[PDB]
Design an enzyme around this catalytic site. Structure first.
Site, mmCIF file in Angstrom:
data_model
loop_
_atom_site.group_PDB
_atom_site.id
_atom_site.type_symbol
_atom_site.label_atom_id
_atom_site.label_comp_id
_atom_site.label_asym_id
_atom_site.label_seq_id
_atom_site.Cartn_x
_atom_site.Cartn_y
_atom_site.Cartn_z
ATOM 1 C CB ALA A 73 -0.948 0.016 1.240
ATOM 2 C CG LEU A 104 10.478 20.339 0.311
ATOM 3 C CD1 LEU A 104 9.453 19.458 0.992
ATOM 4 C CD2 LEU A 104 11.884 19.955 0.737
ATOM 5 C CG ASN A 111 11.043 11.089 -9.579
ATOM 6 O OD1 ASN A 111 11.850 11.127 -10.518
ATOM 7 N ND2 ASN A 111 9.717 11.113 -9.761
ATOM 8 C CE1 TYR A 114 5.272 6.312 -3.615
ATOM 9 C CE2 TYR A 114 7.268 6.479 -4.937
ATOM 10 C CZ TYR A 114 6.156 5.756 -4.521
ATOM 11 O OH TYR A 114 5.926 4.473 -4.998
#
EC number: 1.1.1.212
Lengths: 404, 402
Positions: free
Chosen positions: A261, A269, A319, A325
């Site tokens: 999940a 940012l 990334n 993330y």
């Protein structure tokens, strides 16, 4: 140079489409032959489906020559979606600095050869503890995974196998027979396929997804012959809820936990709000940690347990727009590395998979660098003030996209 | 592309102010340490954003990265430097702390890909055994918080526990030092000589005899010495040692193993010559020079070994099974020899240059969900009990990485 259609696993089919050549010198070649002789077509001096080179006997850089001597004359006979595997000795555990260096150097070899191979062929490097027993049974699952259509999209990676013996499954094609596996994010996508693969391999799956997945999750549980649990893994009660489901359906026990999940709330940012940061940390990092520690902590997952987290290449490479993330996915690597020692004491393994893409100016600074830039990094190491800095390897690359 | 600010003698280290924030054990020592040479703030652009992550003991705490950077990033200057300082994760007191501190790499590498106008990011880990003054961190921070680090971006630095003493002058740090630089005739080696000379070192510039003219030329530009020889020859160490006994009281402080060759070739088509020569120069030689010079006392306490790795050695490159092997080997040397060299008061490090003046994977395609599932199924196997702590990409060997 077009992509090959990757051979993937189909039940009953031979694991390689061609023969397996196992060479090299060291402690793996003999048992690995012994172990693979029946299920694979072993050849020595059709196309080669696999080339496996025991590099464990290379104990100094000079011996790296063996790699060249083994591979060069056979590479032209490597088959469709062939498998190249070098097995080496865990470098950190080497008996000498010479051996560590040679065994560490292997990875340059395998990753480079990976970029030379044709027609969907892959390379892998597998390190094995020097404390493994001669039969090297702990290595077998890795080799059979690599030497099969199952590893179709695993390429140029490094595997690390410890010292312990292994018992094979009753059936290598039903390796998870009897096992109970929790898969989060299971309603759809990779989650749902994990579930399916698990069910195909004989596991009973507890398919978890959020309440809003609704029938999707029930479709998954139906398809895989398992059960659906609707749940927010970030909820305080998530461990109690899963623990209850397990008591109800599986004698209070799971064997396998997959923290799949995850959510993206992409935003640079500079423009990131609390919501998009917190939500992603909550689902992707805090929840998996809490599920793992909860379910191990209350005995739901015991001896023989497996925890597998979904990391990401973003977690490795960074990334753009994904500081949240990528932090969580690097986090997932952190969970994996951080709990491994504790979980091993409990007979539980923890690993992570980092998917990439699943259905010049190449650097953040958008330019080539100057020699002085390399010099400056070297002068930094050279400084008498840099005495607390050792064993570092620093790229001077303007954060080049390319890497491991 | 931003024209990158590089080091010029006597300019300010950064082009704007230095903001050092966060909570942890590094913020105050660093403020106190960098207060004279930098414009500390705590309108005009930030030249430096430094965040102390070392106080973050659990993943809930990572919010701090966001609370600090989000409101200041919009004000980061031309060729700004963002540095996050964390605790070495393997050394954290808790799994929660390790996880959080390990997490920082995803952050810093991501942010690096978001900064504009030549600005960069770095991650520095500092041993939790470092003393409060964190003196051992200083050189790393000054390197990062300057134009010297122009092309270093997204990387991770790992600083141990030992205290440091600053050089007498941070802008002549190698003053009175003797540096052996191999492959010094031309190119990167020549520049290494130049930069070492600039920083005060006397450079012993080594290359092959067929390169004697350019070498002499290099030795002249840097006020150093030209010693030509084959570093792969058995007598290399002795010759170098002799030169040192003759000119520098038998002692060198810095060895930079920069000499290397390429003999590119697909492995299928590679002859012994292309393999062996690459191995000899790039891996065997530096290992022999290093063990050789350290072994006979030429390099002792305070000594520095710097090796040239390469992105090929990290990422692999087509046609360089040989070169990559040697370059990963060079990582090996760095890692393998560090502990035993530490005991002799010597550090060994490596720099890996990059480019110096769906289909992006070896399998030339995207993967399928099943491909990921299979990898997970493999770990899940009851027969995979000997496999733990692994992280495995399922990426068709994507070009992208660290």
């Amino acid at each position: 140079p077009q992509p090959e259609t990757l051979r993937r696993y189909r039940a009953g089919e031979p694991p390689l489409t061609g023969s397996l050549l196992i060479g090299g010198a060291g402690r793996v070649v003999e048992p690995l032959r012994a172990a693979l002789e029946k299920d694979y077509d072993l050849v020595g001096n059709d196309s080669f489906g696999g080339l496996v080179f025991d590099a464990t006997g290379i104990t100094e850089p000079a011996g790296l020559k063996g790699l060249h001597e083994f591979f060069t004359p056979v590479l032209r006979n490597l088959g469709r979606c062939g498998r190249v595997v070098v097995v080496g000795g865990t470098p950190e555990a080497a008996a000498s600095t010479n051996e560590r260096i040679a065994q560490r150097a292997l990875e340059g070899f395998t990753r480079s050869l990976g970029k030379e191979l044709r027609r969907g062929a892959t390379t892998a490097l597998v390190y094995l503890s020097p404390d493994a027993k001669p039969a090297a049974t702990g290595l077998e699952s890795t080799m059979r995974f690599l030497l099969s259509a199952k590893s179709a999209y695993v390429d140029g990676q490094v595997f690390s196998v410890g010292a312990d013996d292994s018992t094979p499954p009753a059936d290598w094609e039903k390796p998870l027979d009897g096992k109970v596996a929790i898969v989060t994010g299971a309603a759809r996508g990779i989650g749902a396929t994990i579930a399916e693969v698990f069910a195909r391999d004989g596991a009973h799956v507890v398919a978890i997804d959020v309440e809003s997945a609704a029938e999707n999750l029930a479709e998954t549980a139906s398809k895989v012959g398992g059960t659906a649990l609707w749940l927010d893994v970030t909820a305080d009660d998530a461990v109690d809820k899963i623990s209850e489901h397990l008591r109800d359906h599986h004698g209070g026990k799971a064997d396998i936990l997959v923290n799949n999940a995850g959510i993206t709330r992409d935003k640079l940012l500079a423009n990131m709000d609390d919501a998009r940061w917190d939500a992603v940390l909550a689902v992707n990092l805090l929840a998996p940690l809490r599920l793992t520690e909860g379910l191990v902590g209350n005995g739901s997952i015991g001896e023989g347990g497996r925890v597998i987290g979904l990391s990401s290449i973003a977690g490795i490479a960074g990334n753009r727009g994904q500081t949240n993330y990528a932090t969580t996915k690097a986090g997932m690597i952190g969970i994996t590395q951080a709990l491994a020692p504790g979980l091993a004491a409990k007979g539980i393994t923890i690993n992570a998979v980092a998917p990439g893409f699943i259905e010049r100016r190449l650097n953040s600074l958008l330019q080539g660098g100057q020699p002085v830039d390399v010099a400056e990094a070297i002068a930094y190491f050279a400084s008498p003030a840099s005495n607390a800095v050792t064993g570092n390897v620093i790229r001077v690359c303007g954060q080049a996209m390319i890497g491991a």
